[PDB]
């Protein structure tokens, strides 16, 4: 019996023991395309749709300060890679995500600035700890645990709102220099949690594919029921090699996560029991700290579109990536 | 307006409204390898391992009559396609499936010839209708429904025995000219079935399907998928290899792939089917037995040799369509 590490709150900072991967350098034509996107969203006269769902050319609103802070160098790069470096597609996708973010109630970088999705709104959804932000894996990705066997609410739109909220918070926890997350999915049934319309799948799929490009860096799956397990194993080789590498179906998590960063349930050193009244306020306060820092940094650098997340999340006095 | 067709038993014969897809005839170089497989398994002094798991060169037994009946032209082709037309792999794979069939208790083509896996042994596993053999789809494949939400037993080796048994029964239902099946999987939870409150069967089942049932899954239709799995299956769908992707259908109407008169009404068909074990099960057992009897007597009438075709063994024409070299 090993000696585990007590923990009941999210790990605030990436430990120094985990290095941040180096970014792939951009070809000449890629930089040129990047500059066009930068130019498009730097336009002082830019106006975008008030929603995605009900978008109209005749109902537009110029960018808010908070939207400029979201429109980062890496945001541009995520969409460029998602759209396979097609300039018009990149611009439209970004535009539509801005549009969706206003509609959904998350365009203001936090409830502190007017977001309608609040911590208090979705807190009940996390009551049984069905989603947990905790730790960092080998490539400095923040970890999001998903535990559908701990489901505590009935299907509703609020489930989607919680889903999006937790995604935004795990993004708040990104270390400077990283912009993708790791999903750790535990499919076990937990009877300890009492089990309680339109299936939310379609909306969640639309949200993940359309508004969260290039965010899934790793997905680790464990405690898979037999039929699902068999299915996943039968199809794994037929999955495209570059997607295949991102997906791990029932292998030890310890090979992708350092032990002191991993829950002991899955072979790690962390002794974690979800305690809502302790965990939830810690996550909310920690996420808020990160956002305050990020936004202060953004204003200190001119409050312009195109700033780097490396700089906005970092602490160096001078910009590592100055804006053209 | 809705007028459904009453049914409570397996449909015995492919309707004539469904064509059997034409086989792609063998090339010149493929025939050559095939003949080598036939020659190997035609050897009258051939001896095979008595099990896969505990295989030994010093524990061998000759081919039984019933095993020669299993060693068909199409059996050879299934392995040839599976092993990418590598002769040594093909022969070895076939050999190990024969060995596993003996080990597992299904080497005799039915309990009537001494199979330890019997209808009575596994019947309790089907009591709530978690697996149902019923109907034929657009390409004449017999349909096997999987309904994991109706699980009625505790995890055990018997569950594997039942899975194999049902697979073997759906193969008995192959129309002459077809050798792949269609899986219709409904993931919905049926609370009306009492759920039992212990090693997972996945590793064994995976090994069995991959190693011992090559080229059997012609089609899988998935429906009533919970949101999370649904999103996953959609998120990964395009990244699946094309030839495998068209094989898999994730939450699309079954009516595109199955004629309505061959399809359960619950999935948009015209068959009003309610699973009644004391009616369904005996009828499944009887019909499969009839099909096996016909298959085996046909085998005997054509010489009782290795390499006969399933088209002839399941068919009724007086002359062989595939005489053996
Ligand atoms: Mg509008
Ligand atoms: Mg038939
Ligand atoms: Mg086989």
B200: closest chain A residue by CA = A226
- What distance in Å separates the CA atoms of residue B226 and residue A201, rounded to the nearest whole number? 8
Please give all residues whose CB falls under 5 A of ion ligand 1, grouped by chain where several chains appear. Answer: A 50, 54, 56, 59
Q: What angle do CA B276, B280, B284 make, to 5 degrees?
A: 160
Length of chain A equals 324
**How far apart are the CA of B155 and the nearest CA of chain A, in angstroms?**
10
A246: closest chain B residue by CA = B236
**Locus of tokens 């709150």:** A9
**Contacting residues of A for B225, CB less than 8 Å apart:** 201
B134-153 core/surface letters (b: 16 or more CB in 10 A; e: else):
bbbbebbbbbbbbbbbbbeb
- What distance in Å separates the CA atoms of residue A13 and residue B222, rounded to the nearest whole number? 43
**How far apart are the CA of A238 and the nearest CA of chain B, in angstroms?**
5
SS (HEC) of chain A: CCCCEEECCCCCCCCCCCCCCCCCCCCHHHHHHHHHHHHHHHCCCCEEECCCCCCCCCCEEECCHHHHHHCCHHHHHHHHHHCCCCHHHHHHHHHHHHHHHHHHCCCCCCHHHCCCCCHHHHHHHHCCCCEEEEEECCCCCEEEEECHHHCCCCCCHHHHHHHHHHHHHHHHCCCCCCCCEEEEEECCCCCCCCCCCCCCHHHHHHHHHHHCCCCEEEEEEECCCHHHHHHHHHHHHHECHHHHCCEEECCCHHHCCCHHHCEHHHCCCEEECCCHHHHHHHHHHHHHHHHHHHHHHHHHCCCCCCCCHHHHHCCCCCCCCCCC
Question: β-strand B60-62 against B47-49: which pairing, if any?
Answer: antiparallel
Residues 6+ apart with CB under 8 A from B15: B136, B261, B262
- Boundaries of domain holding A110: 1-324
Mutation pick from A146, A206, A227 vs chain B, by most beta carbons of B within 10 Å, is A227
B229–A235 C-beta distance less than 8 A = no
H/E segment holding residue B183: strand B181-186
- What distance in Å separates the CA atoms of residue A200 and residue B225, rounded to the nearest whole number? 12
Phi-psi label, residue A225: left if phi above 0, alpha if psi -120 to 50, beta otherwise: beta
As a whole number of angstroms, the longest Cα–Cα distance in chain A is 66
- What distance in Å separates the CA atoms of residue B165 and residue B171, rounded to the nearest whole number? 10
**Contacting residues of A for B202, CB less than 8 Å apart:** 224, 226-227, 229-230, 233
CA of B171 to the centre of ligand 3 (A): 10
**Contacting residues of B for A249, CB less than 8 Å apart:** none
Residue A57: burial class (beta carbons within 10 Å; 0-12, 13-18, 19+)? exposed
For residue A51, the ligand closest to its alpha carbon is 1
- What distance in Å separates the CA atoms of residue A101 and residue A113, rounded to the nearest whole number? 14
Q: What angle do CA A42, A44, A47 make, to 5 degrees?
A: 95
Instruction: Identify whether the C-beta of residue A134 lies closer than 8 Å to the C-beta of residue A280.
Output: no
Resolution in Å, one decimal, please: 2.3
A239: closest chain B residue by CA = B240
B227–A201 C-beta distance less than 8 A = yes
For residue B287, the ligand closest to its alpha carbon is 2
List A136's β-bridge partners, or say none. Answer: A142
Question: Among residues A179, A158, A161, which one has the least CA distance to residue A170?
Answer: A179
Domains in chain B, number: 1
Breaks, C-N > 2.5 A, in chain A lie after 196
B241–A243 C-beta distance less than 8 A = no
**Contacting residues of A for B234, CB less than 8 Å apart:** 201, 205
List A181's β-bridge partners, or say none. Answer: A216
Long-range contacts of A191-198 (CB under 8 A, 24+ apart): A193/A128, A193/A130, A193/A149, A193/A150, A193/A151, A193/A152, A194/A152, A195/A151, A196/A151, A196/A152, A196/A153, A196/A154, A197/A154, A197/A155, A197/A156, A198/A155
* Residue among A205, A240, A243 minimizing CB distance to B234: A205
Residues 6+ apart with CB under 8 A from A138: A18, A256, A257, A258
End-to-end CA distance of chain B: 57
- Tokens read off for A214: 């290039």
- What distance in Å separates the CA atoms of residue B184 and residue B136, rounded to the nearest whole number? 11
- Tokens read off for B261: 């008169």
Instruction: Identify whether the C-beta of residue A165 lies closer than 8 Å to the C-beta of residue A207.
Output: no
CATH number at residue B64: 3.40.525.10
CA of B181 to the centre of ligand 3 (A): 13
- Chains A, B: CB contacts under 8 A, how many? 61
Query: What are the Cα distances from residue B232, in Å, to A216, B171, B236, B238, B239?
Result: 12, 31, 6, 11, 12
Question: β-strand A47-49 against A60-62: which pairing, if any?
Answer: antiparallel
Instruction: Identify whether the C-beta of residue B183 lies closer than 8 Å to the C-beta of residue B134.
Output: no
B231–A205 C-beta distance less than 8 A = yes
End-to-end CA distance of chain A: 57
* Residue among B155, B230, B235 minimizing CB distance to A208: B235
Phi and psi (nearest 5°) for A191?
-60, -25
Query: What are the Cα distances from residue B97, in Å, to B91, B207, B222, B229, B231?
Result: 10, 11, 29, 33, 37
A33-43 core/surface letters (b: 16 or more CB in 10 A; e: else):
bbeebbebbbe
Per CB distance under 8 Å, which residues of B are interface residues toward A?
Answer: 146, 148, 155, 200-202, 205-206, 209-210, 225-231, 234-236, 239-241, 244, 248
CA of B137 to the centre of ligand 2 (A): 12
Q: What is the dihedral of CA B24, B26, B29, B31, to 10 degrees?
A: 160
A238–B210 C-beta distance less than 8 A = no
């Amino acid at each position: 019996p090993k000696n585990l590490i007590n923990i009941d709150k999210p790990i605030k900072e990436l430990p120094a023991s985990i290095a941040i991967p180096k970014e792939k350098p951009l070809t000449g034509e890629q930089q040129k395309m990047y500059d066009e996107v930068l130019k498009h969203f730097s336009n002082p006269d830019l106006k975008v749709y008030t929603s995605e769902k009900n978008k109209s050319e005749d109902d537009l609103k110029p960018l808010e300060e908070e939207e400029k802070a979201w429109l980062t160098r890496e945001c541009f790069l995520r969409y460029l890679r998602a759209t396979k470096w097609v300039l018009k597609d990149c611009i439209d996708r970004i535009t539509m995500t801005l549009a969706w973010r206003r509609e959904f109630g998350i365009s203001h970088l936090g409830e502190e600035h007017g977001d309608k999705i609040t911590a208090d709104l979705v807190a009940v959804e996390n009551e049984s700890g069905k989603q947990v932000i905790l730790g960092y894996e080998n490539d400095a990705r923040p970890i999001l645990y998903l535990k559908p066997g701990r489901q505590n609410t009935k299907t509703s739109h609020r489930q989607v709102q919680h889903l999006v909220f937790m995604l935004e918070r795990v993004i708040d926890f990104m270390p400077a220099g990283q912009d993708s997350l790791a999903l750790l999915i535990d499919f076990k049934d937990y009877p300890d949690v009492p089990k309680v319309p339109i299936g939310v799948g379609k909306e969640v799929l639309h949200i993940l594919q359309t508004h969260y490009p290039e965010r899934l860096g790793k997905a680790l799956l464990t405690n898979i029921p037999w039929l699902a397990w068999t299915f996943l194993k039968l199809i794994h080789p037929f999955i495209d090699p570059l997607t295949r590498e991102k997906l791990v179906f029932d292998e030890p998590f310890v090979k992708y996560v350092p032990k002191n960063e991993l829950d002991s349930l899955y072979g790690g050193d962390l002794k974690f029991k979800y305690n809502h009244d302790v965990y939830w306020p810690a996550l909310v306060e920690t996420a808020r700290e990160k956002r305050d820092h990020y936004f202060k940094r953004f204003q200190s650098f001119g409050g312009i579109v195109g700033l780097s997340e490396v700089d906005l999340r970092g602490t160096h006095e001078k910009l590592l990536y100055p804006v053209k």
